[PDB]
Every structure is written in structure tokens, then in C-alpha cells.
Design a protein around this ligand. Sequence first.
Ligand SMILES: *[C@@H]1O[C@H](CO)[C@@H](O[C@@H]2O[C@H](CO)[C@@H](O)[C@H](O)[C@H]2NC(C)=O)[C@H](O)[C@H]1NC(C)=O
Ligand SMILES: *[C@@H]1O[C@H](CO)[C@@H](O)[C@H](O)[C@H]1NC(C)=O
Lengths: 35, 85, 119, 232, 158, 61
Amino acid sequence: MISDEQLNSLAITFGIVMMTLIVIYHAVDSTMSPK
Amino acid sequence: TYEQLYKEFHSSKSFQPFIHLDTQPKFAICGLIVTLAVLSSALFAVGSKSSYIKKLFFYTILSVIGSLFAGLTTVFASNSFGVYV
Amino acid sequence: KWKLFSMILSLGILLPSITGYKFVEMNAIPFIARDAKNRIMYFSGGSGWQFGIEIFSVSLMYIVMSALSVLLIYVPKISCVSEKMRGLLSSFLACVLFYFFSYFISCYLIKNPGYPIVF
Amino acid sequence: DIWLSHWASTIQFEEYYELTNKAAKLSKGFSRLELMKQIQTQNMRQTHFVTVLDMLLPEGATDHYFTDLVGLVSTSHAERDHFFIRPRFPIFGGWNYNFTVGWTNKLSDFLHVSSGSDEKFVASIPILNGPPDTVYDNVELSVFLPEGAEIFDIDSPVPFTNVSIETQKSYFDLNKGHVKLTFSYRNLISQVANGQVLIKYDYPKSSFFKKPLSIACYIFTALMGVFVLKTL
Amino acid sequence: EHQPVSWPAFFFDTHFLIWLFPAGVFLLFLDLKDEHVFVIAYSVLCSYFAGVMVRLMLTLTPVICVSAAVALSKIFDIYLDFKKPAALLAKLIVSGSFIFYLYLFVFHSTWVTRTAYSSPSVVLPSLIDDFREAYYWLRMNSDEDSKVAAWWDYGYQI
Amino acid sequence: SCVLSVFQTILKLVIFVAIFGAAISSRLFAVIKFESIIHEFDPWFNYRATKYLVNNSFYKF
Ligand SMILES: *[C@@H]1O[C@H](CO)[C@@H](O[C@@H]2O[C@H](CO)[C@@H](O)[C@H](O)[C@H]2NC(C)=O)[C@H](O)[C@H]1NC(C)=O
Ligand SMILES: *[C@@H]1O[C@H](CO)[C@@H](O)[C@H](O)[C@H]1NC(C)=O
């Protein structure tokens, strides 16, 4: 079974990936969209 | 006859597995990648504006492949997770 | 001169509510507490107590940070100053917000001394 | 239960014991003070209540687990070829304990492909491996052959009371599940009723590869349904 | 759980949305539309009711996010729009601080869940379990139609 | 905008996959360390009524 430290690292990596892709999307939409 | 079945048991060869359980996670991930790298093209095709017959054809032809690949990844992943077959 | 009154009536009940005004109201706590040396203390060790001055300080810091954010939003809508100095002012405001948040966490450490996440 | 599986090439055992102590009941009722004061002295020689059981598993076992009706018991310990089990409470005279214990073994030790053909298999399942000296008042031995197996021969070294063949569905069994073969024995001893049930079946490759296809069918149907639902 | 609560327990389970929350309310007040009135009323009601009673903090958790995102998203647009190094440097300095806050947000909302809330309520980790042992004794060794009398905050487990 | 919509859609699906994985994975901290059980006195009754709904019919429940 997966350990506890491995699960902690997995959760942190999922959160970092999510918070980075969200910012990438927002920074693409702010420029590419007609303002 | 118990004696003859017990005689046939030991004489015969052992069981050689098809794909060893130690290298199944590799195939699991390498099939999970492909089964979504292909099934996105299906949604792009159906979304795209074109002839209905051509859309149907270029949807099913690369949907059957994604079907097979997903139906063969969902066995390797299930074995790798600890719930066999 | 009507939306400003609803704004005041909204924030004046939003800000003291998240700062536990009811907690100091439900349990009578003195606004100012004196130490053994008769020195006014501003924060109480632990997480299950609070002094009436802490409400004011916390709400003031919340106001400062929210106001800095709103000011960051409002900076590009002025033309009395040049573009470059406008960018410089925005950067200065961001830096002030950074250091104020650091100071706020430094103050929160008093209420929870075993907090790993720090600047 | 004994779950055969050719894709993963593992045979996993799961057993559900209902255990009763038959020794003399204790008068004055239980009292933890006396128990915890007598074990601190050297008096745990051959006491008549059960504190630790010693399951004797096959040669190489992995993924041991010991489970109870109300959850997982954490007082278990798996050394080499031995699985020590500590119940929740010591089983005095007249007390019942129902538990479950499971493990996994390599399949290469129990199957053998035949000589004439490469699709006829012979399996030799052990009939009992539990505590050292118990007595079983009912035994229900279930062997779960894979989805498309078909039995040709069944032999047992101890006369059984009842044999039957059914089907039972399990994970990713989308048609007819697994083939369950169940024997019912009545009186068995722990270490002197040592035998091996010999099953002889066949498993053609035309049904070995039907397991991925039976999931591909559902996924393809779901996709062809989403297509119609989105184009209409 | 039927009590009021001090200010630390608001920063505890909302890392930095708690001081973008007034900013979001004010920025909704700036340009009122039909739905902004709903969001503001929801925000003020849940804020007061969570300040009074702590069991109702969960209901306040949605509006802490929705109000904060509106406050934060606007900032990003202004500072993420690229339409001049002297300005790109300011844009980067203003957006990097908030990305850093978002990362501290993740590193906080993972630590809090790991430490506080993920505690089993039937097995004390000091690993002792004397509730399941006695309950299993009652389940195994007592007849099916027997009545057990205990205080009212264990009956469900029994 | 011809190539923009498709990029935004793919990114809006990757982001939601990551969101689901970060919401599901951040809660399994008491299930990895300790066996999957029912915490909190109250949920026990809900569990017993779900067992009674899945063993008997809907009318009996
Ligand atoms: C645990 O195991 C015991 C032992 O078999 C079970 O007790 C039997 O229960 C049935 C129905 O209640 C009775 O008809 C039998 O007479 C009982 N046997 C003995 C030896 O007393 C019990 O049902 C099992 N399960 C639980 C939850 O206790
Ligand atoms: C043997 O098992 C079968 C399968 O359920 C059953 O129908 C039959 O009645 C049993 N016979 C005896 C004597 O137990």
C-alpha cells in the first residue's frame, strides 16, 4: 500500500500542478481575449 | 481415478505466465497515455463541422482503437492496483 | 449618497463578525489587560482566548491588506502620473503588501507557536 | 475461497474462521486484574485460553491480512512461513471469535499445463492449512476458476459430503462471472486430514483474450452512445 | 460545536482568502448587478451567523472562495495583460507575489488536513482500541436480544 | 480564435482532472494510515440505514 509521506507528496504535487495550470489559463485568457 | 490424475499432475510442465506481474505497471501507464491521446481526436472530429458520413467514419475508425486500448489498459491497471483480473 | 451607506452598514457587520466580536461579547473579556509588571498586553497565548484590543488590531490589519489589494486594482486608472512611475507605484504597493502579510503571520505565530508555514 | 487468475498469475486465499473454545468455563466471571497480574509472572506455560494462534501458510506467501467483523486487527505478525495472530480478547471457555485471514501465492506452484495440449490445466489446491491442532465441524471449500473455464475432472483425497458447480460474478466480470466449484466436508482434523484436491479443466485462448474485449465492448458502446447524444 | 469562536480559527481554515474577502465584497459593491446583491447578502448573512455560532462555518466556506476569486481574478487580468521592460518588470513583481500566496495556500491547506482533521475517532493513536474490543465482545458473546444501557453519546456506535 | 478555443478546452479539462485529483487525494489521510472505517458517532446510524436500504427494498426502508 502507498505510504503516508508518499501520499503527502502526491497531494502537494497535485495542488501545485492545479494552481500553476490555473494561472497559465488566466494569463492566456487575459491577453488573447478582446479587452 | 485419483492415482492417475495425481500421476499426470507431477509429470507435466509448470505454468509460464503471459506477461509477468512485475512489468504490468509500465504497460498500464503507456496504455493510459495512448487511450486518451487518441480519444481526444474522436471528440475533436465529432465537434468539427464536416460531412456527416465522413464524421461518422473518422469517429468510429479511431474510436474502435481507443476502445481496445482502454479495455487492455483497464486490466493491467487493475492488476497493478492489487485487484486481479 | 446612498450606496455608501449600505457599504458602511455591510462592512461594519462583516468585519467585526469574522474577528470574533461575539466571542468577546458572549464571555465578558476586558478590553485592556495588565501584566504582572503593569504592561498592557496585546495578544493572548493560545488559540482559545482573545482580548478586545485584538479585535481592533486584527480588523485594522485586514483593512490594510484589502485596501492595498483594491489600490493595486485602481492604480492603472489614473493619468495624473506617467506610466513608468505608475508601474513603480504598483510594485511598491505589492512589496508593502508582501511585508505586511509576513508581519501578520509573525503575529499569528503568537496564537499558534507550532506553525510551520512562514515566510 | 481460492481465486485462480491467469492474467496476474497469482492464486490468493481467503478464509473465514468461526472459532469456539471448548475448555472449562471460568467461574466468578472475567477479571482483567487477575489476568494481567498472572502473565507478569511466568505462568503462561500451557494455559487453557487462546492468546495467540499460529497459522501455517504455504511456502511463499505475500500480502497477508487479518480482518475482523468490526474492522482491521493490528496485532498480527508474519514471519517466514508462519502467521501469528492475536485476537482482540483472549478466548476463554465458551467464547466465540469470528475472523478472516487472507494471503497471496504465485500461481506457478499450483497449476500445471498438460503435455498433449497447451490449454489443459491441472490444479492441486490444498484442502486445509490453519492452526496446529483444531477440529472442523463444517468445511466449505470454494474454488473460483476464471471466467471461461470448463471443468473436465474433479478428484478429492477425503470423501466429501456435497459437490456443486455454480457461477459467481466478481470485479470486471461482465458476463457469467467466474466458475465456482464448491465442496462440503463435515468432519476434518487439522494436521492429519492433509490432502490436495485435484481439478482438471481447460481454458482456451479464444476465451483468454475475451476479457479485454468484454470491456472494450462497453467502452465502444458508451462512445457510440455519446456520439448520437451529441449529434442529435 | 454550539459556541462562538475567536479570530484564529478563521485564518486557520482559510489561509489568505480571509483578507481578500472584504476586498471581494467591496469590489462587488462597486458595480452592483442583479447577482451581486445575492452574493453580498449571502456573504453578510453567513459571516454574521458564523461569527455567532461555529457549527455554521461550513456554509460560509463557499462565499469565502467565490468572493475572493472575484477579488483576485481582476488583479491578474490587469497584471497579466500584455498589450516595454519597465512595465513587464512591474507586472511580474505584482503577479509573482500572488502566485507565491497561492502556493503558500496549498502548503497550508495540506498541512492543516494532515495534522488536525485526519484523526480517527474510534482508535486513539496514543495504537490503542478498547472500544472495538468491548463492542466485539458484546457482539460475539451476548445473546442477540439483550439490552445495553449506556449514556446517550455512544448509542449509535453500540 | 480558431486555434484558441481548442487550447482553452484542453486546458479546461486538464485543470479539472488536476482539481479532482487534488480534492480526492487530500482527504485519504485517515484511510491510508488506518483501515477504512466510519468516523464520528453520527455517521454510524446513516451507515446502518444504508445497509438496511440495500438489504431490504425501498418500501421497507
Ligand atoms: C459467529 O460465530 C458463531 C459460531 O458459529 C455464530 O453463532 C451461531 O449463530 C447462529 C445464529 O445466531 C446460531 O444458530 C448458532 O447456534 C450459533 N453457534 C454457536 C456455536 O453458538 C455467530 O452467528 C457468528 N456471527 C456473529 C455475528 O456472531
Ligand atoms: C448439495 O448442493 C446443492 C447445491 O446447492 C444443493 O442443491 C443440494 O441440495 C445439496 N445436497 C445436499 C445433500 O446437501
